[PDB]
Amino acid sequence: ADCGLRPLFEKKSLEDKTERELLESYI
Amino acid sequence: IVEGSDAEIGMSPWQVMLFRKSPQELLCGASLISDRWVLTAAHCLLYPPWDKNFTENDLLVRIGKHSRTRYERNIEKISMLEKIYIHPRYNWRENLDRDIALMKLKKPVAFSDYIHPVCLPDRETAASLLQAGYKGRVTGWGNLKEGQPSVLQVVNLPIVERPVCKDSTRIRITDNMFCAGYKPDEGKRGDACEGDSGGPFVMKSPFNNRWYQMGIVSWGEGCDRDGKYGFYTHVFRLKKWIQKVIDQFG
Amino acid sequence: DFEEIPEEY
Numbered sequence: 059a060d061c062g063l064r065p066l067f068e069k070k071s072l073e074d075k076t077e078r079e080l081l082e083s084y085i
Numbered sequence: 086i087v088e089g090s091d092a093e094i095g096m097s098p099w100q101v102m103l104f105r106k107s108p109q110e111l112l113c114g115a116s117l118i119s120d121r122w123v124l125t126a127a128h129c130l131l132y133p134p135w136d137k138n139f140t141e142n143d144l145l146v147r148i149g150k151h152s153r154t155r156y157e158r159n160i161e162k163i164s165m166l167e168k169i170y171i172h173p174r175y176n177w178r179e180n181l182d183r184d185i186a187l188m189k190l191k192k193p194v195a196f197s198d199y200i201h202p203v204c205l206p207d208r209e210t211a212a213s214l215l216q217a218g219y220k221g222r223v224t225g226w227g228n229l230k231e232g233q234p235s236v237l238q239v240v241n242l243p244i245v246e247r248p249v250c251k252d253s254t255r256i257r258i259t260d261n262m263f264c265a266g267y268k269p270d271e272g273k274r275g276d277a278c279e280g281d282s283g284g285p286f287v288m289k290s291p292f293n294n295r296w297y298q299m300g301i302v303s304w305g306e307g308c309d310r311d312g313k314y315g316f317y318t319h320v321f322r323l324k325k326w327i328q329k330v331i332d333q334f335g
Numbered sequence: 336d337f338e339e340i341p342e343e344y
């Protein structure tokens with residue numbers, strides 16, 4: 059149900075320092 | 086992890102440390118997939134060429150960690166094992182095919198800011214994300230080079246095309262594995278290494294913004310060698326066995 | 336290298 063949603067990031071709408079590197083590669 | 090960086094607090098809250106009771110030492114990485122099930126590499130528990138065959142009572146699971154060596158009072162949680170389940174067709178003899186194992190915990194672990202399960206992929210997430218060039222993330226407390234880190238390390242690595250994986254190695258590769266890392270021409274580098282074994286290769290779904298564990302740190306030739314890649318257990322391809330185990334004994 | 340863990344576990 060809530061797997062994969064980190065309390066300290068996704069649950070707060072905070073991004074970690076390099077997750078955008080992953081997004082940008084999903085082309 | 087080679088050429089990675091320190092994890093942020095709470096960045097990988099499914100991260101699990103497999104810890105040897107006596108002597109007290111790291112054994113492997115692993116991941117939290119629910120309040121009582123931990124996922125790891127079979128070779129973390131069973132590898133007869135190295136005289137490794139662990140039983141439940143030999144081990145502890147440490148969850149919520151950041152520091153490698155420190156006891157992280159009020160944050161980490163330590164659990165004992167009720168039962169280990171290894172893939173019946175795990176091939177330790179040749180190539181680590183189906184390098185996967187589950188561990189059932191004696192007691193449920195309490196989720197917290199530092200402790201939270203990762204998702205396991207369904208077929209459509211797997212088909213969308215496991216593409217050459219797509220990057221995943223692998224985390225661990227293993228060697229920094231082919232000493233040891235003070236805290237959890239992180240590195241993001243691109244999946245590599247199957248022909249390139251096969252051509253990089255003399256090992257017989259299977260459909261139950263994928264490889265990842267940069268090519269020598271790509272500049273950037275990084276890799277898993279000794280002690281990262283069993284830890285998770287995760288990807289963040291751009292469809293639902295959730296983290297999924299697509300791989301398990303499985304094997305490599307040396308670490309961060311030019312022209313060589315890390316090899317990961319293909320979690321989706323072995324999901325039926327995972328479901329089967331959990332459905333039957335959970 | 337490792338700090339010892341509480342006796343309980």
Ligand SMILES: N[C@@H](C(=O)N1CCC[C@H]1C(=O)NCc1cccc(Cl)c1)C(c1ccccc1)c1ccccc1
Pocket residue numbers: 128132179180181256276277278279280281282302303304305306307308314315316317
């Ligand atoms: N170096 C071996 C290996 O990776 N093993 C031995 C069993 C434990 C596993 C291991 O050390 N995994 C940790 C690790 C290190 C670096 C990157 C990753 Cl992703 C993971 C590997 C291998 C051995 C000789 C020649 C080429 C490849 C292997 C492969 C299959 C079967 C036997 C040996």
Ligand code: NA
Pocket residue numbers: 251252253254255256
């Ligand atoms: Na080859």
Ligand code: NA
Pocket residue numbers: 266267276309310311312313314315
């Ligand atoms: Na390499």
